Design a protein around this ligand. Sequence first.
Ligand SMILES: CC(=O)N1C[C@@H]2C[C@H]3c4c[nH]cc4C(=O)[C@]2(C1)N3C
Length: 130
Amino acid sequence: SMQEEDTFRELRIFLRNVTHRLAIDKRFRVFTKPVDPDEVPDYRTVIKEPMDLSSVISKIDLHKYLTVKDYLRDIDLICSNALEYNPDRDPGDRLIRHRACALRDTAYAIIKEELDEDFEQLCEEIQESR
Ligand SMILES: CC(=O)N1C[C@@H]2C[C@H]3c4c[nH]cc4C(=O)[C@]2(C1)N3C
């Protein structure tokens, strides 16, 4: 229905606003674009599904996310990729792991404060009907 298409349009407006707020935070600059395969040639042998905040906005605009749950699976993949590629005790690995955990915790905290639980349940019920 047109009312269901209006629901998904509101979901996209909300996800673009959350993603912009993460992308301007100086702590998260390393997660704003794909890892450059020229600069890091073993990256795509270790990490089988690369993800970053520029790819996330592209996916919102392609109508890939029909729930906040499917959006958070990609925020979780940005964080888990950083923990798996950079697992060592040295300061550069520890700094990126700390930033990755802060990106995930910031996204979940914005959604807990600003997403209505009945708006998410409506999106999940339209998705399950398709
Ligand atoms: C997000 C993530 O896991 N990394 C690991 C890469 C290694 C190191 C680097 C050196 N030159 C480009 C680089 C990157 O893009 C990354 C981003 N680092 C900063």
